[PDB]
Amino acid sequence: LKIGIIGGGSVGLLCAYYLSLYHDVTVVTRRQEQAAAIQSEGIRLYKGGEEFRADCSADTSINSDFDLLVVTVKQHQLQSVFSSLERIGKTNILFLQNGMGHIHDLKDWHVGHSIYVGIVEHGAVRKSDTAVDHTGLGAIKWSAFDDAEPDRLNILFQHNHSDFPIYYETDWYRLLTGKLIVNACINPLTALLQVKNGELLTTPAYLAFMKLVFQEACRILKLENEEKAWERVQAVCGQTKENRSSMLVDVIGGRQTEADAIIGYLLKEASLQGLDAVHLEFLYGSIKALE
Amino acid sequence: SLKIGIIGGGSVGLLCAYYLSLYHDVTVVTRRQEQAAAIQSEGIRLYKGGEEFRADCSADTSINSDFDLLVVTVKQHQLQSVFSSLERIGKTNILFLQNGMGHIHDLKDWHVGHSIYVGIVEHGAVRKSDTAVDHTGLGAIKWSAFDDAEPDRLNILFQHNHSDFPIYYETDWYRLLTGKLIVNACINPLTALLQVKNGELLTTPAYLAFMKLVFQEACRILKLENEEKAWERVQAVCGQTKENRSSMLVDVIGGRQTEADAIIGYLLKEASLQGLDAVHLEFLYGSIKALE
């Protein structure tokens, strides 16, 4: 089976290494220089002290009939990808973008492809055009979008390396919002307060502010069980209690953030339902300023 | 004449030194000898809309006279050393013109023989150099007695002033100070985080709503007499300064210590003493402090 990975960023290279253990992989990239380099060297994965190399093809456009295309580009790059995908024969496409900003776009992208969405819980850092460091051993979880048939991806993902496990979930909306609610409540606050996830629980005022944010976002996302979801946010917080969140990390290092993909999404949905999002908008304004 | 020491050689200190020098013997007590030397050298220059005046003034790096009045204009962070000097001199009149109300907690439990006065500065003033200040905003100083100080003590001192340096007595120190604090507390922290000019608080629906939430906390902590009127004022002053970047926004952009402790930190201490919640104030404080 042929798999195409669209995007040669950290996530795209990580996916390329692990999936090439089972399948014929091609990295589809926007830079001829990256394509050539992968074509010559394959992909290098680092994990702990150890280095491994996977043979992988590359190309700057889609020139094969891929059984699956995995989209790993950032929101800046998504519209150009839709256009490319419109020019190919019906196949399976899995979008792995962080946040839910792209979902408005997906809802009204009407094509004949079978669409799947997923979340990447791994940590990865790109080192060069051909090299990636697997810094956090996580998982990928995926679901069918718009009634696509899950069994189209089951054979592809049946067997994986124990460090690349892949889990299916039936409800894509629950899947994406379960992750989004957590990131929305934690990431902005730790970025502005510059504290570990754990101090959000241990400072009564910070916990109370996170609850205000939660109550706004939970309403916007129309989550099924408010109290259970709030338990989960606090529980995910206690489990990651020593972590400087990803956005806090982006912040000390002056990298642009997932503010658009995470909070921007809540703002657009709040506007459409005529919902109030005072705390979310303040956080959005404050993080956009730091960028 | 009478002797006045101005503690602090920032914008307000130089402005007060210029105008009080017209009637009295002034010394500016500056922390840097180079400023003290430079004032003692070409005097103080004040710029006021096309005119430039010069006043001769003394200067020093320590309080080593018995002044008839001391006027304290330094940032809160240096206030601690000031207090320490204020113990080794003879009892006198001290007028605190500090921004914020963090000094009010220090003064509350201050055992001294000093007569304590407290006031606000409504002038616009911008320090141009070690010796020069631009009087950009023709305002006033307003002052009150703190605790049991006798107001009449400042009668002769403030009997005569330049038309552009008026000074007004107000009977209620707490109303005077809180009335300026409610405004600073609502505008400054918010602008510092959002990095927008003041007017952007009024014209962005969510930002205005967030300001209101901050106002409601601060208003309750301070126990402000007329709440509806104070809220109008906050929005009013926002309107008057629409194109301005607040002083706290400026401090944050510049990597300088802010007046968070004197503005917000005081409200936090007060919320705590009353078992009141101040969740928005606390988040603002933590975020501004994180930047320092």
From Swiss-Prot, chain B:
Catalytic reaction annotation? (R)-pantoate + NADP(+) = 2-dehydropantoate + NADPH + H(+)
Q: Which Pfam families match?
A: ApbA (PF02558), ApbA_C (PF08546)
Q: Per the record's keyword annotation, is Phosphoprotein included, yes or no?
A: no
Record's GO cellular component, any one? cytoplasm
Keyword terms, alphabetized: Cytoplasm, NADP, Oxidoreductase, Pantothenate biosynthesis
Q: Which residues form the active site?
A: 180
Protein's UniProt name? 2-dehydropantoate 2-reductase
Native organism? Bacillus subtilis (strain 168)
Please name the gene that encodes this protein.
Answer: panE
